[PDB]
Amino acid sequence: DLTGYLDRINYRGATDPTLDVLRDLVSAHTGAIAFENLDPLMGVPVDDLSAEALADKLVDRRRGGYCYEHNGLIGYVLAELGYRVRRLAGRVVWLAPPDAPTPAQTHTVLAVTFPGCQGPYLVDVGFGGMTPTAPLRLETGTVQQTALEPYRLDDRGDGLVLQAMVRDEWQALYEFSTLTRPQVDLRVGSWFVSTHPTSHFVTGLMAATVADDARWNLMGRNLAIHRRGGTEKILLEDAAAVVDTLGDRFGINVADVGERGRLEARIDKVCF
Numbered sequence: 001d002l003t004g005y006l007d008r009i010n011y012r013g014a015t016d017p018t019l020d021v022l023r024d025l026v027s028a029h030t031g032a033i034a035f036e037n038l039d040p041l042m043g044v045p046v047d048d049l050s051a052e053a054l055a056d057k058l059v060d061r062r063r064g065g066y067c068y069e070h071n072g073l074i075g076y077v078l079a080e081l082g083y084r085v086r087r088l089a090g091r092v093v094w095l096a097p098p099d100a101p102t103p104a105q106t107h108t109v110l111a112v113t114f115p116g117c118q119g120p121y122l123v124d125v126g127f128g129g130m131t132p133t134a135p136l137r138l139e140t141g142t143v144q145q146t147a148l149e150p151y152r153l154d155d156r157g158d159g160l161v162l163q164a165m166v167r168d169e170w171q172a173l174y175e176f177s178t179l180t181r182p183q184v185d186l187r188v189g190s191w192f193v194s195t196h197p198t199s200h201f202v203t204g205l206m207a208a209t210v211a212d213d214a215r216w217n218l219m220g221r222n223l224a225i226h227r228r229g230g231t232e233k234i235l236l237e238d239a240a241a242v243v244d245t246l247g248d249r250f251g252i253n254v255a256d257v258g259e260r261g262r263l264e265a266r267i268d269k270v271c272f
């Protein structure tokens with residue numbers, strides 16, 4: 001802690017708080033720690049947002065987690081490296097209507113600065129399927145390239161909206177204030193998302209990771225692989241198959257959950 005972590009993400013690795021080092025960290029982290037909701041899905045809330053609790057889960061126990069766990073963790077880490085970290089909250093609007101009941105603030109992201117930096121950067125290793133896998137400049141109007149899809153920040157409110165080009169369209173991901181939010185608001189937001197019985201993190205399975213050079217997205221028993229925009233689709237045949245995929249492909253420590261019969265029947269109910 002940090003050698004636990006820098007080793008878990010396989011970064012090796014210079015540690016000075018520079019732009020180069022921020023890009024490489026965000027790259028290794030998103031390549032090694034899957035987005036997943038196995039806990040909420042198993043009726044285990046995500047409540048404790050401390051460095052010790054998140055480190056224990058996403059590093060020592062070799063699990064993934066969601067936005068609060070991912071951006072919680074990588075935030076304690078950059079802080080330690082001597083980056084300056086502000087936590088922000090956001091509402092998710094990915095594939096929202098029209099229809100749109102205003103969404104809850106169920107997302108958290110980071111505004112990061114460092115010595116001699118050219119302005120703030122946005123860090124979000126916890127969105128899931130569409131997470132930006134590079135730090136983005138906290139500036140509006142500029143189209144910003146990554147190893148995968150391009151990103152753009154626009155004014156909305158009061159706040160910003162992050163969009164990404166997917167296929168032949170700009171799609172909105174989440175809206176957010178640049179105001180710092182206290183840890184306690186993050187914890188309230190996490191309680192909601194992990195325990196509210198109509199939460200999609202409670203009622204279905206979702207996983208995401210990046211294995212080169214592509215998004216591997218799991219939603220139920222549907223696995224989508226987006227490489228260079230092209231989507232390949234795999235329908236997993238049974239719950240045993242999905243648990244195996246979570247273990248091999250998504251590199252999650254499934255026994256940590258961790259009676260495989262019990263995970264398999266939740267998956268089967270869910271699912272299935």
Ligand SMILES: CC(C)(COP(=O)(O)OP(=O)(O)OC[C@H]1O[C@@H](n2cnc3c(N)ncnc32)[C@H](O)[C@@H]1OP(=O)(O)O)[C@@H](O)C(=O)NCCC(=O)NCCS
Binds near residue numbers: 108127166219229
């Ligand atoms: C569950 C999740 C990982 C799965 O994403 P997914 O498997 O690609 O499916 P989605 O519902 O997100 O996307 C739907 C469509 O967009 C397409 N798409 C998504 N990403 C794409 C990309 N990288 N390139 C091309 N197409 C893409 C999908 O193929 C699908 O198209 P289709 O059904 O019309 O063929 C994702 O929706 C997710 O991470 N959820 C959001 C998390 C959240 O609420 N925020 C974090 C707070 S904790």
